[PDB]
Design an enzyme around this catalytic site. Structure first.
Site, PDB file in Angstrom:
ATOM      1  N   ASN B   9      -2.876  -4.138   1.350  1.00  0.00           N
ATOM      2  CA  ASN B   9      -1.798  -5.113   1.444  1.00  0.00           C
ATOM      3  C   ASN B   9      -1.554  -5.363   2.920  1.00  0.00           C
ATOM      4  O   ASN B   9      -1.152  -4.448   3.638  1.00  0.00           O
ATOM      5  CB  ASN B   9      -0.543  -4.603   0.742  1.00  0.00           C
ATOM      6  CG  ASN B   9       0.678  -5.532   0.911  1.00  0.00           C
ATOM      7  OD1 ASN B   9       0.712  -6.430   1.740  1.00  0.00           O
ATOM      8  ND2 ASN B   9       1.671  -5.319   0.070  1.00  0.00           N
ATOM      9  N   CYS B  14      -0.010 -13.120  -1.529  1.00  0.00           N
ATOM     10  CA  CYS B  14       0.247 -13.589  -2.892  1.00  0.00           C
ATOM     11  C   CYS B  14      -0.960 -13.396  -3.796  1.00  0.00           C
ATOM     12  O   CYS B  14      -1.391 -12.264  -4.016  1.00  0.00           O
ATOM     13  CB  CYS B  14       0.698 -15.063  -2.908  1.00  0.00           C
ATOM     14  SG  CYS B  14       2.051 -15.494  -1.685  1.00  0.00           S
ATOM     15  N   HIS B 249       5.715 -10.397  -7.034  1.00  0.00           N
ATOM     16  CA  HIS B 249       4.619  -9.446  -6.873  1.00  0.00           C
ATOM     17  C   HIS B 249       3.409  -9.910  -7.680  1.00  0.00           C
ATOM     18  O   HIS B 249       3.553 -10.333  -8.835  1.00  0.00           O
ATOM     19  CB  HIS B 249       5.038  -8.045  -7.308  1.00  0.00           C
ATOM     20  CG  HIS B 249       3.965  -7.010  -7.138  1.00  0.00           C
ATOM     21  ND1 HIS B 249       3.671  -6.065  -8.102  1.00  0.00           N
ATOM     22  CD2 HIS B 249       3.133  -6.758  -6.094  1.00  0.00           C
ATOM     23  CE1 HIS B 249       2.703  -5.279  -7.658  1.00  0.00           C
ATOM     24  NE2 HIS B 249       2.354  -5.681  -6.445  1.00  0.00           N
ATOM     25  N   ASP B 266      -3.766  -3.539  -8.319  1.00  0.00           N
ATOM     26  CA  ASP B 266      -2.457  -3.720  -7.692  1.00  0.00           C
ATOM     27  C   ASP B 266      -2.640  -3.380  -6.211  1.00  0.00           C
ATOM     28  O   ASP B 266      -2.277  -2.289  -5.747  1.00  0.00           O
ATOM     29  CB  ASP B 266      -1.410  -2.860  -8.345  1.00  0.00           C
ATOM     30  CG  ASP B 266      -0.019  -3.124  -7.797  1.00  0.00           C
ATOM     31  OD1 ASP B 266       0.954  -2.616  -8.390  1.00  0.00           O
ATOM     32  OD2 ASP B 266       0.102  -3.846  -6.780  1.00  0.00           O
TER      33      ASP B 266
END
Lengths: 15, 330
Positions: B9, B14, B249, B266
């Site tokens: 991340n 997005c 998220h 994720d």
């Protein structure tokens, strides 16, 4: 862009 | 405990990490990406090489994979860059770049082969003899969500006939204003279908229940089916958003092998999950966690599209370039 105004195949710029 | 590694991340990108996994597990795409002739490419501005680098790292790293060279190569680098673009534009940016880079090579035409379909739309005047037909190529299918219970209802909406009558009467030029119909049918559906769900309208987010299946038969929306190749599609990926338009998220669910064994991607955490979490739990309802993009693979093309990728599929020239890059930085 397609008949329905949606984006089609490839890169077509801004409407 | 997965066998799959995650993406770092590194800012509010997005949909990007979800899409990168999605394209990475389009194994036929992946192998063709490895074949692109990028030896002469400038790294700081080569998106085809930056996608090779990301896929190399996804296939080989045991640690989460960074993307900063990739977002630099296509120039989205401000805080809210990805919130001013949408996933359809990033799809087109990545696929068109790699398509062009394969022009003139052994893998030329891979992107159309995987992703191009053809449709025909028409205007038929109800009361004089005039018809206009329009064949065009498409990539993804944007499906309307609002007021549609399920994907079948959306395709029905996509191809529903439109009356051009009374005030919106079609002008048939020589014939003047005329009552007409307008309609649509698919001529072909590509091996890989990217269905874009119109949950984010204008700015709002529709969180309503929208049912989509594991196996999706589409013969009904073709102008002409054939037997021994039904347009039967298998669900591969569910790109998911949580929120109410405002930020949110982003996560993607995938069964990379097409065998219905699902994983949740994720960012840096790839974890294993139930089929229910990937499918029915992303229907939405009134939860605000739900699919905005679905990837289906044509059943007859699945083994083809998801062909095994080995280390021998990545050229030496490329492997050596990427490892040399790593040497420098260290």
């Amino acid at each position: 862009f397609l008949x329905n105004x949606x984006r089609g195949y490839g890169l077509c710029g801004k409407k | 405990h997965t066998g799959y590694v995650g993406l770092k991340n590194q800012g509010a990108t997005c949909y990007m990490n979800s899409l990168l996994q999605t394209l990475f597990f389009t194994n036929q795409l992946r192998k063709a990406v490895y074949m692109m002739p990028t030896e002469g490419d400038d790294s700081s501005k080569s998106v085809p090489l930056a996608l090779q680098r990301v896929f190399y790292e996804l296939q080989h790293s045991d640690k989460p994979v960074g993307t900063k060279k990739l977002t630099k190569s296509f120039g989205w680098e401000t805080l809210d860059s990805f919130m001013q673009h949408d996933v359809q534009e990033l799809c087109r940016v990545l696929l068109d770049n790699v398509e062009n880079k394969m022009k003139g090579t052994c893998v030329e035409g891979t992107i159309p082969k995987l992703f191009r379909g053809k449709m025909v739309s028409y205007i038929q005047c109800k009361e004089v003899d005039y018809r206009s037909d329009r064949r065009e190529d498409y990539y993804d299918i944007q499906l309307s969500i609002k007021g549609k219970k399920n994907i079948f209802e959306s395709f029905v909406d996509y191809v529903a006939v439109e009356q051009l009558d009374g005030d919106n009467k079609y002008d048939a030029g020589e014939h003047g204003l005329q009552e007409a119909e307008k309609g649509v049918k698919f001529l072909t559906l590509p091996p890989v279908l990217h269905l874009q769900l119109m949950r984010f309208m204008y700015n709002i987010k529709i969180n309503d229940r929208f049912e989509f299946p594991e196996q999706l038969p589409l013969d009904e929306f073709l102008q002409k089916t054939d037997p021994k190749d039904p347009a039967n599609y298998i669900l591969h990926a569910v790109l998911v958003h949580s929120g109410d338009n405002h930020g949110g998220h982003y996560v993607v669910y995938l069964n990379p092998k097409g065998d219905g064994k699902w994983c949740k991607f994720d960012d840096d955490v790839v974890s294993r999950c139930t089929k229910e979490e990937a499918i029915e739990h992303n229907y939405g309802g009134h939860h605000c966690t739900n699919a905005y993009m679905l990837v289906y693979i044509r059943e007859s093309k699945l083994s083809e599209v998801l062909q095994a990728v080995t280390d021998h599929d990545i050229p030496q020239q490329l492997v050596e370039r990427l490892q040399e890059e790593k040497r420098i930085e260290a």
